[PDB]
Design a protein around this ligand. Structure first.
Ligand SMILES: [Mg+2]
Ligand SMILES: [Mg+2]
Ligand SMILES: [Mg+2]
Ligand SMILES: [Mg+2]
Ligand SMILES: [Mg+2]
Ligand SMILES: [Mg+2]
Lengths: 521, 521, 521
């Protein structure tokens, strides 16, 4: 009822053998969006052209690791386990409070509206465009004490061509009121359980072996290969002779191998040092999107980012590329920056053990056929798809990164591991929608068929609990020497990091991946 | 109670074999009508003369197809089925909220009145004048997100003569408080179930055969007929001779037939092009009602419209008549128009397969008896009632048209299919009345027998759910070639049709009938 | 629910054989602390340097005897029992009322917020820094009619060095939202039971025997000892001779004894008479902390106070030291005083029966080896730790003093009896935290990922009950003559002491220990 709480606060984590359960509770605030309306969106902006609808609904997003793990819990996870994956999820929305806002001569006053409801439903059949996996804001804040605003639900429709936002007969419009939903007054609560499909464990380890060094460095191969086609050390000089050799130690680059580095697409490398880059504007015919690796879908350019899993530059190197995820640093509050130091660069350098380098190339190959009179040019293999015998590691997941992505509803897909990182799921955690039910204001006393457009101003607030059961696999290495471990090593600090400062503001100072432990190939 | 919702939101449609259930929930707002009073209505206006009462009650109207079907659901229905009819209905009124309005120096303020009630009863015995089947506004809005105002209940009484509104001893007055009703506070809800009597399936198909072409075009008839009464090709010329002939192919117009086109009454045809019509004023002795086909009841004229089912002009033709239903187009907000393009014209052209044409005539017949010296005039059969051997198709139902009508309580009726379209029912879905119970304002401290006339200003709001079970009959044609199908074919549109626009306004762009599929005779 | 009390008032004490149960109910008021935030604390102040966090949480403190005993009950306890210890505890928090505060042009107005909650949890696993045992304010007021403010929870972190407040990687941050907590609306209550570990009985008696007088004063010892090394009464004079003697009566100071006075550390003695002390400033290089006995931890000075149990000066003597607990007298409202008469001095003079004197020394010992030509200096034993054969009594507990302390979580500890007095417990009564759940104010209608920082002003209030079962051991003395008893002996008083005065203010006029009864060694 009114004077009885419909749920309690729960924010712990229980570790067991092969399992860990996270529990997170936060307070949310839901305003009335679009003034209770559905607005048709759309704008012709060349490669940025889009169309769709903004809805009056809000939705819950739990798609970031820091929503579920405290920094210390993340450390417990990554320093001791080789793998992890989500198993189950339970969500609760309770302690609903609908507030009525009234304006007067001076300030505005808020009051409880005990009879008003909010509507809530989970799109458990995936009938609505899924947007919880687009690397966007709106997830539960990392800090348990923070109160967040429920994000407004909106979706994009089919864009035809690369110049007009105009919709065709294929474009769909989805009305969310057209779905069944629970109506909740201040005493009611909402709950939903979900199970994850079996997904592979994320690999929480860096490789301690290189793909091109899997042989016994003490033994020769029983395989032979061409060593040279002339005597000497000079090109186009010496005596022509087919010099063959048994492949033996210290000539590892020429050993016959069973496996190849995974697929790759060359990205453009930029320096964190301004004057080290070519001057390329943000807009115009020569905008940056042009000089950045990009895919073309229906004439529209889409920057390749982060792109396929590739080895990148170290997080502290002077260079970076679109293959690297960049987060706002602890002192970054705006939405633009000219100083890279205010941002947090992630890195996939551990991938150099099996994956090709993002700003380099997969390799080289002949530009033609050689002969005693023709030396072919050495062509660059800047892009290469799946070839039999290739192996690769997916990119890493981050503490402040996404957890899952919905695998697109298509006939074909190659290695459905979301490129921003995480778990590709056919049936991901369902989107949960919430909306403040409209309450008509004082009506006219004469009938009118015109739809009511006068409403009492309201907003709701409540709590949301999310519990995730995770399956983990402990590292079982036989390595003798100490491993690398994520450790607090900031030294002397005026204000303890990973903690609210003197003013009470909580910020995340660094990006934490999951690859400290190692594993051989 | 107060802090517990008395119902949930439900707006889906479940399709099965031979059945489809629609569920629709909307938010309503009920003001206090007539200031809690019953007012005797009446006005002497010649053929428009009327009398009756306006009541302080409101009522629920679910009598339009778009209240139950989304446009896509309507398409699923009409492209795949030959017939449909309502089977059952369930209505729920819940989440009642009574608001108290108070005025001050500045703006007015609204507040919840937790102890106030609303009264609700269904006229399940049909003791009150039925008005839910008069093609009037007040039904649930087509769009699930729209909030509507509950229409005020009023009824007409017996009009005597064609000049005075004066009532006679036969006139009835109905007091709705004189009925038992449920009283509901914020925690209470109201429910009612209803079953439809067996009614014929509406025919959702156009005929692919003509009534005058039901013969084998390759065979002669064994019947003979008079071919001419003279030799030659000129009238009143040649040699008198009774020329008889066996009725054979390519003389189909003279074949002996078993059936005739249905009854018909000639309507007047008007052009959508202004200068193509005769100038006829709206009022005066020469008003339009005079030149339009009209019936006369007790001296009062009543335009024949839509009138008996007849073949009309195509919806895009330059002409129309009173036989065609006209709806306001998507950009029509006013109540008058001089440009037909802002309106939506429906058509019954598919009826030309069995029904006579509305602006033409049923046929021709002799003005007298012919002889060797007298050629009778060719009289026109502009009106003709039921004749043995006639067959006809009823007019079509529309997405935005009415569903049922109450068959008048009379001794006789011919083919009780409502002329505006739909299902004629003896016992239609009952009218559900709702009213805000009056709450007396501060009384005098001295007794007075005078009826209280000071009330606290109030209004209520809540939700209403309507579920209809429909029986459908799938088309089972042996036709080889593709059928006509209702399809989204608007091409490129700045704003997707059948969807809210950029400002959030939802409008219906076209009228959708149910006759795309075909059936032979 | 709302109109039903969630608990009753209970403030009695039930005495039985070997047991007494105290029950105390008080009304509390909880404001919003830190504006719902966690603030990182810290300040470089040499030996006063500290760092930590203030939390938005409040907590309940029951750690003072006068919270549970009325003065008369304390008298019943101390005049009849030799020992007492806590056995069990039960706490209830009920009749929660959340108030919403609104400001206007004139005065501010308060209103009930029936849907708001408060969060409550007990740190039953001791995962949070324990601060209920630091001799600090915030406990239930001694007077049953007094309404108190719930103290704000804050904790100190590790201080490194003695000059900077800077935190290191070892510093911990604890988020209390990270714990599971009960959420309570106006109808809910919170309860918790606790059992005390077996602890020794506090000794509520003074010794009627001296440690150096445990022999039969009528009998000689069969042990001999050196009486002198010369003839006569003058030092360095007479005839050298080893004079031995059987140890007999009236030479008790030289009797061989089995036990020694307990450990001790010399404290500095100051006069209550200003001009009798040396002039030492509060701050500077020559501050008082310098001339007061102090321990040094990581370079920081910490005054030895109260320090190890030692015999002090009588409570009315002209001198005192840091070994004595000082409370504010009945007329002391400020936080500073120059007149000792406004303060209440406690005393541990009864400890002179077995413990060394605080401002004196444990004893004396030779500064070297003596001979016929060298008389060693008489060195002072100002500090001495545990030596085999030592015995001592702990300091006394007071009516207005602390009950328990948490024994530090360490590998080693010597005699874990808290120095301020009371019971040392490994698992003390758990800290109970309470906080007003934040209620977001009117939000923007456009989504923002920024954490909400606009809240409705609130505060809560309710009742708290605390019941403690105490185990007591009756004195069973064979003493013939009357014992000393704590008695009301204030004589004629304009306003009865231990009672509210004419203005209604309640104050405690004296400190009451527990040592009136006696016991032999
Ligand atoms: Mg987040
Ligand atoms: Mg698909
Ligand atoms: Mg409608
Ligand atoms: Mg009748
Ligand atoms: Mg106290
Ligand atoms: Mg410890």
């Amino acid at each position: 009822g009114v004077g009885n709480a419909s749920g309690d606060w729960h924010c712990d984590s229980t570790w067991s053998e092969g399992h860990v359960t996270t529990t997170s509770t936060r307070t949310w605030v839901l305003p009335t969006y679009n003034n209770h309306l559905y607005k048709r969106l759309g704008e012709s902006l060349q490669s940025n052209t889009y169309n769709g609808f903004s809805t009056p609904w809000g939705y819950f997003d739990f798609n970031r690791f820091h929503c579920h793990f405290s920094p210390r819990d993340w450390q417990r996870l990554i320093n001791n386990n080789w793998g992890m994956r989500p198993k189950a999820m339970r969500v609760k929305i309770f302690n609903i409070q609908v507030k009525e806002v009234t304006t007067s001569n001076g300030e505005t006053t808020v009051a409880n509206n005990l009879t008003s409801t909010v509507q809530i439903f989970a799109d458990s059949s995936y009938e609505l465009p899924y947007v919880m996996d687009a690397g966007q804001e709106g997830s539960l804040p990392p800090f348990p004490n923070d109160v967040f605003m429920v994000p407004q639900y909106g979706y994009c429709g089919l864009v035809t061509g690369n110049t007009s936002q105009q919709q065709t007969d294929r474009n769909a419009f989805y009305c969310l009121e057209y779905f069944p939903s629970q109506m909740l007054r201040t005493g009611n609560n909402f709950e939903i359980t979900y199970s994850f499909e079996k997904v592979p464990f994320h690999s929480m380890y860096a490789h301690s072996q290189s793909l091109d060094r899997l042989m016994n460095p003490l033994i020769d191969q029983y395989l032979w290969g061409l060593q040279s086609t002339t005597t000497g050390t000079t090109l186009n000089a010496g005596t022509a002779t087919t010099n063959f050799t048994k492949l033996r130690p210290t000539n590892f680059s020429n050993f016959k191998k069973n496996w190849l580095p995974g697929p790759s697409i060359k990205q453009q490398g930029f320096s964190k040092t301004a004057n080290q880059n070519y001057k390329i504007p943000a807009t115009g015919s020569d905008s940056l999107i042009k000089y950045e690796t990009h895919s073309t879908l229906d004439g529209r350019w889409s920057a390749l980012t982060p792109g396929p899993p590739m080895a990148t530059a170290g997080p502290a190197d002077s260079k970076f590329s679109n293959s690297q995820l960049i987060f706002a640093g602890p002192k970054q509050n705006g939405n633009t920056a000219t100083v890279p130091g205010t941002l947090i660069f992630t890195s996939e350098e551990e991938l150099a053990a099996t994956n090709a380098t993002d700003t380099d190339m997969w390799g080289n190959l002949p530009g033609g056929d050689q002969s005693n009179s023709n030396l072919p040019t050495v062509d660059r293999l800047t892009a290469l798809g799946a070839v039999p015998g290739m192996v690769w590691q997916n990119r890493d997941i981050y503490y402040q990164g996404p957890i899952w992505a919905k695998i697109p509803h298509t006939d074909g897909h190659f290695h459905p591991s979301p490129l921003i990182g995480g778990f590709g799921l056919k049936h991901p955690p369902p989107q949960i929608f919430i909306k403040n039910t409209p309450v008509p204001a004082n009506p006219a006393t004469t009938f009118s068929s015109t739809p009511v457009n006068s409403f009492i101003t309201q907003y709701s607030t409540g709590q949301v609990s999310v519990q995730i059961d995770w399956e983990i696999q402990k590292e079982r290495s036989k390595r003798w020497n100490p491993e690398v471990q994520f450790t607090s090593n900031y030294g002397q600090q005026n204000s303890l990091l990973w903690a609210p400062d003197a003013a009470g503001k909580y910020t995340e100072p660094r990006a934490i991946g999951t690859r400290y432990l190692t594993h051989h190939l």
